[PDB]
Amino acid sequence: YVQARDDILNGSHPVSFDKACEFAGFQCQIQFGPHNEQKHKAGFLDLKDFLPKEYVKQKGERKIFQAHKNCGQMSEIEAKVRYVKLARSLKTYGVSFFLVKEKMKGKNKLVPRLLGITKECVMRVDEKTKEVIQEWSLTNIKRWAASPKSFTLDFGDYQDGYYSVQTTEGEQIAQLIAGYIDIILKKKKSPPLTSAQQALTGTINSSMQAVQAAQATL
Amino acid sequence: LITMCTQQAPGQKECDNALRQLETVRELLENPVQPINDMSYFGCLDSVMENSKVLGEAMTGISQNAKNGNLPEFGDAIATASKALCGFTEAAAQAAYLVGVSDPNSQAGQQGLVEPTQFARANQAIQMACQSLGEPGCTQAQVLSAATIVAKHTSALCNSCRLASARTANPTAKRQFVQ
Amino acid sequence: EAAKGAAAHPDSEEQQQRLREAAEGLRMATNAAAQNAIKKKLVQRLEHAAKQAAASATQTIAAAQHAASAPKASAGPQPLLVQSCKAVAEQIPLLVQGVRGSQAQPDSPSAQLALIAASQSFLQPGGKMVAAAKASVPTIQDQASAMQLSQCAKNLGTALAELRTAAQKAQEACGPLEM
Amino acid sequence: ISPEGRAAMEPIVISAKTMLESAGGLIQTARALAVNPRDPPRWSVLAGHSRTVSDSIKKLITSMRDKAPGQLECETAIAALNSCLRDLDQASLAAVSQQLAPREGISQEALHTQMLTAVQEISHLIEPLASAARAEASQLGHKVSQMAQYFEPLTLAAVGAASKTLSHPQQMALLDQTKTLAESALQLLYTAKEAGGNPKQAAHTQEALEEAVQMMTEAVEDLTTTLNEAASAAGVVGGMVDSITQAINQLDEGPMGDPEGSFVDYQTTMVRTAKAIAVTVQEMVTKSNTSPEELGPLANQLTSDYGRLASQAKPAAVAAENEEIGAHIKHRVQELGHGCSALVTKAGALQCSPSDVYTKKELIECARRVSEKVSHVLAALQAGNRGTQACITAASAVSGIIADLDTTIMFATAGTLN
């Protein structure tokens, strides 16, 4: 429960603001009763604790409280199991996440999307939507390389024109790739002549024979 | 002349009018080198569809009349059929023009600033108003009719002048258009 | 006194035209033993412009020959340049003779009027020249010919610039007696 | 006309013919039935003639529907450009991972020139392309042909840029712009191909078209910035000369349309331009006294300025009543072109040789001359008798007044005034 809560605090985990509110309901029930959140409304202990920084800035007003009511009389272990299963339901698990801004197709703008990667597949999730925008498996990868600022994501020949990811920590992601591509290894079972010069020379010829022709015409 | 001078009782006087216009538009099609009208691609497509509708309903009307044998309705129907016949024929010619231009190596042209057919028709309309004006005692009705007709034609030609002025090249040319 | 009156009030059109008439009066008055040479210098610049006009033209034609020599799709290479060069080729000789009469028969004002007309006519194809030029720019398969035509077109655009300038010099230098 | 177009239409020609001969035979049957309403073989051949009519009707319809005028070629471009994308991505790989290598025989600047040329063409024709997507497909397919056959060489330019350029993040960015270009290209391909110049296509098509059009726009001018700013980085660039000439020729052609904006508005525009160019050029002189390197940005901004000047001068030129003033302003702005040509020329020459004093002598005399051309355009717009040029000048004056008064009020706050 608490480690998934911590991943929530990271913002790595794909959680909707609404989904964050239901997790906040679970947390308010495991930490207090339904009436406490009814007693007082401010609750950074409801906001700061339950939510990541963007969500506390979102100042979740009373959808969180309604999620509390929905949890209501569920025991601490009841909401704990609910939270755990709800967190497992997302494809978030076994998966690494990295906040990145990526060149959006059509024109030079950078899209806010999350780098969700598991040991065997690579997803693609918008940070403001928390659903996967595009998906791949490890198998699909046929090449890779990371700049200090980005990384190359070979989606194989099937995908037309992969998109690279602009990443500060891209080299760390590439060492992950080394660790990632480890699973595929585990699966396996035991001059005087220049191009410019020659083009120049062909031009020279073309010209000289043209010269001979011109002289003859003369 | 055929119509209001020779009686409709033969009816097939419109048949031969159609035969005439048939051969006319036939040659017209035969050399597609020019467009009949601005009326464009999708427009002529439409024209084709409703024209074909006209043909189908003619297919109905003339056939049922001939079964009856009642000549007048038969003749009116087949004459309208001929009208639609004309219609699609120029439609097809002009679609030919447009999309023959559409060939990748086909070299289009602007075909200039004149729309001589419309102007000339206006010219003859003006001439006809003048001709009506030539005879001393003429009914006021035709006078008023021609007056309004030439008014609208003159206005349209004024629009033509303005359009050319906008679109042409020589500043003095558009000046003379204005004057 | 024109200056003083302008000092009285700046933008009064009366003052502006007074200065105008003053200026050309100074001109005309200078044009007692002069405007022989003043018109002559007007010219001198003019035929300068004409000379490099034709030079750029020779550039264009050479570029046209290499250009047509190039493409495997030599037939139907979609060139505006072929008609472009044909037009300027037919456009050169009159300008040539205008220059020739200007130098050979300078005093005869009508000859320079003729050269003025040759200039202003010669202008029109410039934009289309550069248009076909830039369009062709990618088309080539020999980037050497690309530079050929490229620097050619720069010549052209510069030219047409000074050409129009010379034209304005003529028009200010105009003498309205051409009839 | 093109022959094979006539050939491909010969089907439609045939079907129209069949219209006509079917009408013929059917109408002799109509004559024969007008003789007698009930003639069995005659009725049979009337039905057969009618059937031929209907058949070739549907055949004309088939030919027109399967005609799809010019659709083929947009997708040809689609695939060509997708291949372009793929190789661009190999470039991105070989750069981000640092394996790509230049063709060192060629030099970068000309490559940029080719970029410029192609994108200029594209930029120019997209709006006519859009209008074709409004009305006509013939020229539509023609234009798309041109733009595709320009894209591929521009792709060649992109690959040169990648393999040659030095600044790794920055060359990567250049190719990002290339990618944007291609994306816009495919998008317009779609928009038009479904659009087909048909007024009958719903406004969804319309929308798609216009926002795509913009997308291509922003792509194009961002490219413009990139290339000309490389030129500024480039020590010597005659490319701006070509821009000036473009200004000149378009100036020459003039706008065939009718005035829209208020002449006084144009006048405001020119005065802003002129004051800008003057302050910029004198500041350029000062920097020439200091150092060359900065003229590049200076030169290119000047170029832009002249372009806007001419651009808005044309509708200004058509926006008055006294065309004589318009052609006078025309004279003025041409001479501006000549002067700025000299300016950038000598600026780059200096950028080659910052040591020479003869260069800077040329610089200052050019600066003088062009200053007088600025004065010329000043007097021209003043001769633009409309409004009151004094109005804008006094607005500037009062603005300075409030600047003074803000200084005074801070004095009071500090109490320095006493």
Swiss-Prot record, chain D:
Residues 1-66 are annotated as: Helical bundle R7B. It is found in: Cell projection, Ruffle membrane; Cytoplasm, Cytoskeleton; Cell surface; Cell junction, Focal adhesion. Residues 236-386 are annotated as: Helical bundle R10. The modification Phosphoserine is found at residues 262, 291. It comes from the Eukaryota. The modification Phosphothreonine is found at residue 268. Residues 68-235 are annotated as: Helical bundle R9. High molecular weight cytoskeletal protein concentrated at regions of cell-matrix and cell-cell contacts. Involved in connections of major cytoskeletal structures to the plasma membrane. With KANK1 co-organize the assembly of cortical microtubule stabilizing complexes (CMSCs) positioned to control microtubule-actin crosstalk at focal adhesions (FAs) rims. Consists of an N-terminal FERM domain linked via a short unstructured region to a large flexible C-terminal rod which contains 13 amphipathic helical bundles (R1-R13). The rod begins with a five-helix bundle (R1) followed by three four-helix bundles (R2-R4). These are followed by a series of eight five-helix bundles (R5-R7 and R9-R13) in which the N- and C-termini are positioned at opposite ends of the bundle, creating a linear chain. The four-helix bundle R8 does not disrupt the chain because it is inserted into a loop in the R7 five-helix bundle. Part of a complex composed of THSD1, PTK2/FAK1, TLN1 and VCL. Interacts with THSD1; this promotes interaction with PTK2/FAK1 and VCL. Interacts with NRAP and LAYN. Interacts with SYNM. Interacts with ITGB1; the interaction is prevented by competitive binding of ITGB1BP1. Binds with high affinity to VCL and with low affinity to integrins. Interacts with APBB1IP; this inhibits VCL binding. Interacts with PTK2/FAK1. Interacts with PIP5K1C. Interacts with F-actin. Interacts with SVEP1. This is Talin-1. The lineage of its organism: Eukaryota, Metazoa, Chordata, Craniata, Vertebrata. The gene is Tln1. The chain holds residues 1588 to 2005 of 2541 of the full protein.
